[PDB]
């Protein structure tokens, strides 16, 4: 997530112009307790994920 956030950031700025990062069938080796971290973090970086 950090990488794909960086790569989309236009030069100088740190708020990417394109926003819609997808995901699919992601959490098949983790507990509901830890997965709650990723969901909050992803939105924190500034992205917006289906």
Partner 1 sequence: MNQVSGLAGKESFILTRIELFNWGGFHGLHQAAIHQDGTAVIGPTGSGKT
Number of residues that bind partner 1 (CB under 8 A): 4
User: Judged by CB, which is closer to partner 1: 4, or 34?
Assistant: 34
Cα–Cα distance between 29 and 24 in angstroms, integer? 14
Q: Looking only at residues 14 through 43 of this chain, which bind partner 1 when binding is defined by CB under 8 A?
A: 30-31, 33-34
The alpha helices in 1-50, defined as continuous H runs, are: 2-8, 32-44
Nearest to 42 by CA among 11, 17, 19: 19
CB of 12 vs partner 1, minimal distance in Å: 39
Q: Which residues bind partner 1 (CB under 8 A)?
A: 30-31, 33-34
């Amino acid at each position: 997530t950090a990488s794909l956030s960086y790569a989309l950031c236009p030069a100088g700025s740190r708020y990417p112009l394109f926003g819609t990062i997808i995901l699919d069938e992601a959490f098949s080796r983790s507990s509901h307790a830890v997965a709650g971290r990723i969901i909050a973090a992803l939105r924190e970086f500034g992205l917006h994920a289906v």
